[PDB]
Symmetry: C2
Subunit: 118 residues, 2 copies
């Protein structure tokens, strides 16, 4: 297990929240607070994800990242898993995803109309 | 009935692609080239959307917008529909959404690792 701690700014709480990524050969888990989602690897199929999604836990914090975000986490994990990325590198690459998510949040439309809505 | 032309930057075509938003009282349409998706207003329920999402058609331009983007379009339309926004207002509010999408694209992770993926 290598653990990656990601700082995601949550407009809901007005602070950065820690999303914890647990990487294993057999599975990956992503938790924020009491919720945990999971992907489990399989030889001849794409990873099996828990019913709960990354968008689920993030939208809960008023974070609205691109739909591909969860798939990025999966890609980072699958590449780390075959040894293409070492521990510090998968950490760096995932931090880039978190940075992107935070930039998306930072750049949200800022008119009266949009501020009132989300 | 009014039409808003939005300019979305596409790394796939190296240019801003024109997304045409048609607002009518009973429905809204969004066109990109030959592709059109549609949301239909219903009196007692949320609008009925195409199953092909705005995100899906943008993914085809190699654009990965926040997942809430389609919902933002819906909001502007519904507000315009009941006259909470005039034609110029709905235009600017939607342009701020396009502007946000463009910022997201511009800020996409650009490490060699991520570029190989998307």
């Amino acid at each position: 297990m290598t653990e990656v701690n990601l700082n995601i700014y949550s407009p809901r709480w007005g602070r950065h929240e820690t999303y914890i990524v647990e990487l294993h050969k057999d599975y990956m888990e992503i938790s924020m607070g009491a919720v945990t989602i999971k992907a489990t690897y399989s030889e001849n199929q794409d990873p099996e994800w828990s019913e709960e999604t990354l968008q689920d836990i993030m939208n809960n914090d008023s974070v609205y990242p691109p739909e591909i975000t969860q798939n990025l986490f999966q890609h980072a994990w699958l590449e780390w898993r075959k040894g293409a990325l070492d521990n510090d590198e998968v950490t760096r690459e995932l931090e880039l995803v978190a940075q992107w998510v935070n930039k998306v949040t930072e750049a949200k439309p800022n008119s009266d109309f949009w501020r009132k809505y989300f």
